[PDB]
Amino acid sequence: AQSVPYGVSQIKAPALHSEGYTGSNVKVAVIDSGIDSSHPDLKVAGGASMVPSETNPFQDNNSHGTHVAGTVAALNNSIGVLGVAPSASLYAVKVLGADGSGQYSWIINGIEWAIANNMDVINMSLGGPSGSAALKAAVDKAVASGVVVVAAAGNEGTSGSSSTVGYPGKYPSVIAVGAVDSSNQRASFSSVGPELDVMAPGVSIQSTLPGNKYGAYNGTSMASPHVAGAAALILSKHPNWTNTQVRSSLENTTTKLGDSFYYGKGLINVEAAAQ
Ligand SMILES: [Ca+2]
Ligand SMILES: [Ca+2]
């Protein structure tokens, strides 16, 4: 039996599904630890590995990338779960090794591959406390080229009046995503700051894991994928919209929650956003 993770329902994805929009023909790049090609609930369109010690992008030795991937697009079938955009073209861009770590150079290489291959959306469920001029140039290049860039805000909670948003989420050209529970209350570990843009479900997210498994994870990393998937749905209904419009729409149709320092514009609503 297939289950619909509540997070999918929480952002109202199923409404677009009933209109017949499930993100067909939208190229989505999951820049992460890879995507387990042996998983029956996932359909991978292609990929590349930027990790010199692990050249097969289809081998997820960390489990992160496979989980994120399932949130974006777990197939609409008789098993497992269901992604936000079940018909989206998924690309495995591996930039993190087994240990969940990666060099900035690998990540930038990953972002450049995504640009060169015309991805419509890029998801980066990763963050670092420090930015680099090179990482900034790369994401700015992606937005300029027309790609929609989504990233986790970070799991550093609060720190008085200080911004705890990690990079690349901190960059203005990137859509930084924080996490809320099922009640719409901000997750205690969710990062905060002027750079936080929107909220999405990040608590106890059921998705796919390597080796034909399923399990729950908590984190802003789990939140990001919900937004990337929303973007795919939007693009499936309005293939013509620029990244500018997709972003504006997602931020202008949110369900306002509390102070923007802690919640950005609030929880996304893809039914509203998709027009
Ligand atoms: Ca399924
Ligand atoms: Ca941002």
mmCIF file of C-alpha atoms and ligand atoms in Angstrom:
data_model
loop_
_atom_site.group_PDB
_atom_site.id
_atom_site.type_symbol
_atom_site.label_atom_id
_atom_site.label_comp_id
_atom_site.label_asym_id
_atom_site.label_seq_id
_atom_site.Cartn_x
_atom_site.Cartn_y
_atom_site.Cartn_z
ATOM 1 C CA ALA A 1 0.000 0.000 0.000
ATOM 2 C CA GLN A 2 1.231 3.530 -0.690
ATOM 3 C CA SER A 3 1.012 6.226 1.953
ATOM 4 C CA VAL A 4 0.895 9.996 1.421
ATOM 5 C CA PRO A 5 3.304 11.665 3.918
ATOM 6 C CA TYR A 6 1.404 14.399 5.770
ATOM 7 C CA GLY A 7 4.012 16.974 4.747
ATOM 8 C CA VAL A 8 2.768 16.492 1.166
ATOM 9 C CA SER A 9 -0.781 17.149 2.293
ATOM 10 C CA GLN A 10 0.308 20.064 4.519
ATOM 11 C CA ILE A 11 1.467 22.172 1.561
ATOM 12 C CA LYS A 12 -1.573 21.131 -0.492
ATOM 13 C CA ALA A 13 0.218 19.281 -3.304
ATOM 14 C CA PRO A 14 -2.615 16.774 -3.686
ATOM 15 C CA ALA A 15 -4.841 19.630 -4.881
ATOM 16 C CA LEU A 16 -2.654 20.154 -7.945
ATOM 17 C CA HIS A 17 -2.544 16.365 -8.458
ATOM 18 C CA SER A 18 -6.363 16.325 -8.793
ATOM 19 C CA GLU A 19 -6.091 19.060 -11.438
ATOM 20 C CA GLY A 20 -3.664 16.765 -13.251
ATOM 21 C CA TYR A 21 -0.411 18.593 -12.430
ATOM 22 C CA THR A 22 2.321 16.401 -10.921
ATOM 23 C CA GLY A 23 5.390 18.065 -12.339
ATOM 24 C CA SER A 24 5.769 16.297 -15.676
ATOM 25 C CA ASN A 25 8.764 17.337 -17.720
ATOM 26 C CA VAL A 26 10.402 19.491 -15.029
ATOM 27 C CA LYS A 27 14.104 18.770 -14.507
ATOM 28 C CA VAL A 28 14.984 18.698 -10.842
ATOM 29 C CA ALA A 29 18.555 18.325 -9.537
ATOM 30 C CA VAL A 30 19.089 16.844 -6.070
ATOM 31 C CA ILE A 31 22.622 18.059 -5.180
ATOM 32 C CA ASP A 32 23.350 15.717 -2.353
ATOM 33 C CA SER A 33 24.912 12.378 -1.369
ATOM 34 C CA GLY A 34 23.517 10.613 -4.491
ATOM 35 C CA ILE A 35 20.276 8.694 -5.133
ATOM 36 C CA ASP A 36 19.886 4.944 -4.682
ATOM 37 C CA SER A 37 18.979 3.703 -8.176
ATOM 38 C CA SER A 38 17.915 0.286 -6.718
ATOM 39 C CA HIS A 39 14.839 1.838 -5.026
ATOM 40 C CA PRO A 40 11.554 0.836 -6.678
ATOM 41 C CA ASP A 41 9.755 3.948 -5.444
ATOM 42 C CA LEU A 42 12.113 6.305 -7.317
ATOM 43 C CA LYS A 43 12.646 6.948 -11.018
ATOM 44 C CA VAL A 44 15.953 8.596 -11.877
ATOM 45 C CA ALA A 45 16.370 10.486 -15.101
ATOM 46 C CA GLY A 46 20.197 10.919 -14.937
ATOM 47 C CA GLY A 47 23.015 12.350 -12.812
ATOM 48 C CA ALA A 48 26.723 12.870 -12.300
ATOM 49 C CA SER A 49 29.147 12.497 -9.381
ATOM 50 C CA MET A 50 31.498 15.310 -8.327
ATOM 51 C CA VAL A 51 33.070 13.156 -5.548
ATOM 52 C CA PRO A 52 36.477 11.937 -6.747
ATOM 53 C CA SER A 53 36.398 9.022 -4.281
ATOM 54 C CA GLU A 54 32.837 7.943 -5.206
ATOM 55 C CA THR A 55 32.178 8.317 -8.946
ATOM 56 C CA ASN A 56 28.717 6.608 -9.152
ATOM 57 C CA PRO A 57 25.987 9.188 -8.371
ATOM 58 C CA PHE A 58 23.486 6.350 -8.139
ATOM 59 C CA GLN A 59 25.192 4.921 -5.083
ATOM 60 C CA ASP A 60 23.956 6.760 -1.976
ATOM 61 C CA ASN A 61 26.339 5.808 0.866
ATOM 62 C CA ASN A 62 24.965 8.403 3.286
ATOM 63 C CA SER A 63 21.196 7.936 2.906
ATOM 64 C CA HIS A 64 20.544 11.688 2.824
ATOM 65 C CA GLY A 65 20.180 12.165 -0.907
ATOM 66 C CA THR A 66 17.816 9.216 -1.249
ATOM 67 C CA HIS A 67 15.563 10.598 1.510
ATOM 68 C CA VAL A 68 15.471 14.107 -0.011
ATOM 69 C CA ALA A 69 14.745 12.616 -3.451
ATOM 70 C CA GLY A 70 11.743 10.673 -2.145
ATOM 71 C CA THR A 71 10.299 13.910 -0.779
ATOM 72 C CA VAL A 72 10.564 15.609 -4.150
ATOM 73 C CA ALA A 73 9.287 12.731 -6.273
ATOM 74 C CA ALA A 74 8.541 9.284 -4.740
ATOM 75 C CA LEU A 75 6.453 7.576 -7.470
ATOM 76 C CA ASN A 76 2.669 7.424 -7.510
ATOM 77 C CA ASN A 77 2.182 3.654 -7.413
ATOM 78 C CA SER A 78 1.215 0.798 -5.162
ATOM 79 C CA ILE A 79 4.107 1.105 -2.756
ATOM 80 C CA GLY A 80 5.950 3.257 -0.319
ATOM 81 C CA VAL A 81 5.265 6.956 -0.325
ATOM 82 C CA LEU A 82 4.367 9.808 -2.665
ATOM 83 C CA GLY A 83 6.454 12.862 -3.555
ATOM 84 C CA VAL A 84 5.332 16.429 -3.965
ATOM 85 C CA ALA A 85 5.944 16.116 -7.721
ATOM 86 C CA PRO A 86 5.718 12.419 -8.562
ATOM 87 C CA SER A 87 6.222 13.001 -12.303
ATOM 88 C CA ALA A 88 9.295 15.259 -12.116
ATOM 89 C CA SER A 89 12.534 14.216 -13.901
ATOM 90 C CA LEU A 90 15.023 13.551 -11.095
ATOM 91 C CA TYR A 91 18.746 14.130 -11.436
ATOM 92 C CA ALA A 92 21.258 12.756 -9.016
ATOM 93 C CA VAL A 93 24.083 15.268 -8.596
ATOM 94 C CA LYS A 94 26.398 13.715 -5.970
ATOM 95 C CA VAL A 95 28.532 16.234 -4.136
ATOM 96 C CA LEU A 96 28.808 14.641 -0.659
ATOM 97 C CA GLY A 97 30.597 11.430 0.277
ATOM 98 C CA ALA A 98 29.667 8.661 2.691
ATOM 99 C CA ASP A 99 30.232 10.799 5.786
ATOM 100 C CA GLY A 100 27.832 13.534 4.633
ATOM 101 C CA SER A 101 30.707 15.906 3.868
ATOM 102 C CA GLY A 102 31.891 17.580 0.687
ATOM 103 C CA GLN A 103 34.442 20.152 -0.476
ATOM 104 C CA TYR A 104 33.114 23.482 -1.772
ATOM 105 C CA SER A 105 34.771 22.701 -5.086
ATOM 106 C CA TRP A 106 32.625 19.538 -5.477
ATOM 107 C CA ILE A 107 29.418 21.449 -4.705
ATOM 108 C CA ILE A 108 30.270 24.212 -7.187
ATOM 109 C CA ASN A 109 31.108 21.561 -9.838
ATOM 110 C CA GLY A 110 27.691 20.065 -9.082
ATOM 111 C CA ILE A 111 25.928 23.427 -9.455
ATOM 112 C CA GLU A 112 27.746 23.987 -12.783
ATOM 113 C CA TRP A 113 26.718 20.581 -14.100
ATOM 114 C CA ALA A 114 23.102 21.477 -13.230
ATOM 115 C CA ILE A 115 23.296 24.759 -15.153
ATOM 116 C CA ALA A 116 24.960 23.182 -18.190
ATOM 117 C CA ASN A 117 22.288 20.476 -18.330
ATOM 118 C CA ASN A 118 19.305 22.866 -18.040
ATOM 119 C CA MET A 119 17.816 21.734 -14.710
ATOM 120 C CA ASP A 120 14.636 23.786 -13.942
ATOM 121 C CA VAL A 121 15.097 23.442 -10.195
ATOM 122 C CA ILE A 122 18.059 22.759 -7.906
ATOM 123 C CA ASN A 123 17.704 21.505 -4.357
ATOM 124 C CA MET A 124 20.568 21.827 -1.885
ATOM 125 C CA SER A 125 19.753 20.150 1.442
ATOM 126 C CA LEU A 126 23.093 21.178 2.853
ATOM 127 C CA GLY A 127 24.611 24.200 4.594
ATOM 128 C CA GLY A 128 27.916 25.437 5.997
ATOM 129 C CA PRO A 129 28.653 28.278 8.423
ATOM 130 C CA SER A 130 30.971 29.867 5.880
ATOM 131 C CA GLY A 131 30.396 31.133 2.367
ATOM 132 C CA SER A 132 33.021 31.629 -0.351
ATOM 133 C CA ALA A 133 33.167 34.024 -3.311
ATOM 134 C CA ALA A 134 33.193 30.937 -5.553
ATOM 135 C CA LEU A 135 30.083 29.395 -3.984
ATOM 136 C CA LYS A 136 28.310 32.769 -4.354
ATOM 137 C CA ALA A 137 29.277 33.150 -8.030
ATOM 138 C CA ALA A 138 27.978 29.654 -8.749
ATOM 139 C CA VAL A 139 24.514 30.101 -7.237
ATOM 140 C CA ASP A 140 24.215 33.611 -8.714
ATOM 141 C CA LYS A 141 25.101 32.053 -12.108
ATOM 142 C CA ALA A 142 22.329 29.492 -11.601
ATOM 143 C CA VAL A 143 19.654 32.118 -10.800
ATOM 144 C CA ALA A 144 20.826 34.313 -13.668
ATOM 145 C CA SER A 145 20.586 31.340 -15.983
ATOM 146 C CA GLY A 146 16.951 30.912 -14.919
ATOM 147 C CA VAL A 147 17.166 27.976 -12.496
ATOM 148 C CA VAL A 148 15.080 28.007 -9.260
ATOM 149 C CA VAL A 149 17.517 27.428 -6.327
ATOM 150 C CA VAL A 150 16.233 26.025 -3.039
ATOM 151 C CA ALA A 151 18.278 25.285 0.089
ATOM 152 C CA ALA A 152 17.863 24.247 3.733
ATOM 153 C CA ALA A 153 18.076 27.242 6.130
ATOM 154 C CA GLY A 154 20.238 25.249 8.612
ATOM 155 C CA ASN A 155 19.598 23.410 11.889
ATOM 156 C CA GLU A 156 21.278 25.970 14.192
ATOM 157 C CA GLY A 157 18.108 27.190 15.916
ATOM 158 C CA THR A 158 18.376 30.630 17.481
ATOM 159 C CA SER A 159 21.117 32.835 18.843
ATOM 160 C CA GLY A 160 19.586 35.955 20.243
ATOM 161 C CA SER A 161 19.254 38.565 17.504
ATOM 162 C CA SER A 162 21.804 36.872 15.285
ATOM 163 C CA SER A 163 21.044 35.143 11.991
ATOM 164 C CA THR A 164 21.779 31.427 12.178
ATOM 165 C CA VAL A 165 21.134 30.779 8.456
ATOM 166 C CA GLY A 166 23.909 28.681 6.907
ATOM 167 C CA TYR A 167 25.328 28.939 3.364
ATOM 168 C CA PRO A 168 24.244 28.843 0.585
ATOM 169 C CA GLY A 169 20.803 29.549 2.031
ATOM 170 C CA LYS A 170 22.057 32.922 3.282
ATOM 171 C CA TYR A 171 22.521 34.266 -0.251
ATOM 172 C CA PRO A 172 19.726 36.540 -1.446
ATOM 173 C CA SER A 173 19.443 34.699 -4.774
ATOM 174 C CA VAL A 174 18.623 31.457 -2.907
ATOM 175 C CA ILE A 175 15.293 30.403 -1.394
ATOM 176 C CA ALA A 176 16.183 29.463 2.206
ATOM 177 C CA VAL A 177 13.726 27.053 3.836
ATOM 178 C CA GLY A 178 13.072 26.604 7.557
ATOM 179 C CA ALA A 179 11.077 23.815 9.241
ATOM 180 C CA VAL A 180 7.722 23.545 10.981
ATOM 181 C CA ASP A 181 6.012 20.558 12.636
ATOM 182 C CA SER A 182 2.491 19.342 11.754
ATOM 183 C CA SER A 183 1.020 22.105 13.930
ATOM 184 C CA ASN A 184 2.764 24.852 11.971
ATOM 185 C CA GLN A 185 5.032 25.627 14.922
ATOM 186 C CA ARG A 186 8.667 26.318 14.124
ATOM 187 C CA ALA A 187 11.007 23.354 14.874
ATOM 188 C CA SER A 188 13.320 24.242 17.797
ATOM 189 C CA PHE A 189 16.366 23.425 15.650
ATOM 190 C CA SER A 190 15.281 25.491 12.628
ATOM 191 C CA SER A 191 17.723 28.328 11.786
ATOM 192 C CA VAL A 192 16.504 31.960 11.985
ATOM 193 C CA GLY A 193 17.386 35.367 10.482
ATOM 194 C CA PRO A 194 16.542 38.038 7.960
ATOM 195 C CA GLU A 195 17.602 35.587 5.273
ATOM 196 C CA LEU A 196 14.953 32.971 6.175
ATOM 197 C CA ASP A 197 12.364 33.012 3.338
ATOM 198 C CA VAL A 198 9.730 30.281 3.779
ATOM 199 C CA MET A 199 8.751 27.359 5.981
ATOM 200 C CA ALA A 200 7.905 23.741 5.033
ATOM 201 C CA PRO A 201 7.420 20.524 7.019
ATOM 202 C CA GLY A 202 10.667 19.251 8.533
ATOM 203 C CA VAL A 203 9.548 17.146 11.481
ATOM 204 C CA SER A 204 9.410 13.379 11.166
ATOM 205 C CA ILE A 205 9.371 13.270 7.355
ATOM 206 C CA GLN A 206 8.687 9.774 6.029
ATOM 207 C CA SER A 207 10.531 9.110 2.767
ATOM 208 C CA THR A 208 12.666 6.569 0.901
ATOM 209 C CA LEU A 209 16.020 5.198 2.165
ATOM 210 C CA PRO A 210 18.680 3.141 0.363
ATOM 211 C CA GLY A 211 18.065 -0.589 -0.027
ATOM 212 C CA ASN A 212 14.304 -0.430 -0.674
ATOM 213 C CA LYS A 213 13.581 0.994 2.775
ATOM 214 C CA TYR A 214 11.649 3.927 4.249
ATOM 215 C CA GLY A 215 12.111 5.989 7.396
ATOM 216 C CA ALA A 216 11.718 9.377 9.035
ATOM 217 C CA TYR A 217 14.207 12.230 9.347
ATOM 218 C CA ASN A 218 13.991 15.635 11.049
ATOM 219 C CA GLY A 219 15.622 18.743 9.655
ATOM 220 C CA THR A 220 15.537 21.767 7.447
ATOM 221 C CA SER A 221 17.117 19.358 4.955
ATOM 222 C CA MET A 222 13.763 17.544 4.900
ATOM 223 C CA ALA A 223 11.955 20.898 4.513
ATOM 224 C CA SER A 224 13.807 22.118 1.372
ATOM 225 C CA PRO A 225 12.650 19.246 -0.848
ATOM 226 C CA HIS A 226 9.007 20.134 -0.192
ATOM 227 C CA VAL A 227 9.637 23.572 -1.722
ATOM 228 C CA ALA A 228 11.719 22.278 -4.650
ATOM 229 C CA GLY A 229 8.868 19.852 -5.406
ATOM 230 C CA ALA A 230 6.311 22.733 -5.147
ATOM 231 C CA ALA A 231 8.327 24.662 -7.696
ATOM 232 C CA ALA A 232 8.142 21.621 -10.068
ATOM 233 C CA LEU A 233 4.355 21.530 -9.767
ATOM 234 C CA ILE A 234 4.187 25.268 -10.476
ATOM 235 C CA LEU A 235 6.379 24.837 -13.564
ATOM 236 C CA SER A 236 4.260 21.913 -14.786
ATOM 237 C CA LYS A 237 1.170 24.171 -14.839
ATOM 238 C CA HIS A 238 3.009 27.302 -16.108
ATOM 239 C CA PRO A 239 5.987 26.064 -18.129
ATOM 240 C CA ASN A 240 6.444 29.668 -19.189
ATOM 241 C CA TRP A 241 6.969 31.282 -15.815
ATOM 242 C CA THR A 242 10.522 32.489 -15.077
ATOM 243 C CA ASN A 243 12.311 31.540 -11.849
ATOM 244 C CA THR A 244 11.501 35.110 -10.743
ATOM 245 C CA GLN A 245 7.758 34.439 -10.958
ATOM 246 C CA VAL A 246 7.931 30.966 -9.375
ATOM 247 C CA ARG A 247 9.777 32.385 -6.382
ATOM 248 C CA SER A 248 7.537 35.457 -6.118
ATOM 249 C CA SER A 249 4.471 33.211 -6.283
ATOM 250 C CA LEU A 250 5.666 30.862 -3.556
ATOM 251 C CA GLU A 251 6.492 33.828 -1.254
ATOM 252 C CA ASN A 252 3.287 35.776 -2.000
ATOM 253 C CA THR A 253 0.818 32.934 -1.330
ATOM 254 C CA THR A 254 2.235 31.604 1.930
ATOM 255 C CA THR A 255 0.140 31.032 5.035
ATOM 256 C CA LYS A 256 1.594 33.701 7.417
ATOM 257 C CA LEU A 257 2.674 32.202 10.738
ATOM 258 C CA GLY A 258 4.650 34.369 13.249
ATOM 259 C CA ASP A 259 7.451 36.955 13.052
ATOM 260 C CA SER A 260 9.404 36.743 9.778
ATOM 261 C CA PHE A 261 12.670 36.555 11.733
ATOM 262 C CA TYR A 262 11.536 33.095 12.748
ATOM 263 C CA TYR A 263 9.120 32.085 9.973
ATOM 264 C CA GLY A 264 10.065 34.028 6.843
ATOM 265 C CA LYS A 265 6.842 34.647 4.880
ATOM 266 C CA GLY A 266 5.289 31.521 6.428
ATOM 267 C CA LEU A 267 4.247 28.073 5.197
ATOM 268 C CA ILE A 268 4.077 27.504 1.415
ATOM 269 C CA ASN A 269 0.764 26.644 -0.208
ATOM 270 C CA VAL A 270 1.364 25.221 -3.732
ATOM 271 C CA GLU A 271 -2.376 25.233 -4.579
ATOM 272 C CA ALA A 272 -2.431 29.023 -4.170
ATOM 273 C CA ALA A 273 1.032 29.568 -5.631
ATOM 274 C CA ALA A 274 0.382 27.616 -8.836
ATOM 275 C CA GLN A 275 -2.435 29.892 -10.033
HETATM 276 CA CA CA B 1 4.971 5.223 -4.144
HETATM 277 CA CA CA B 2 17.841 33.513 0.937
#
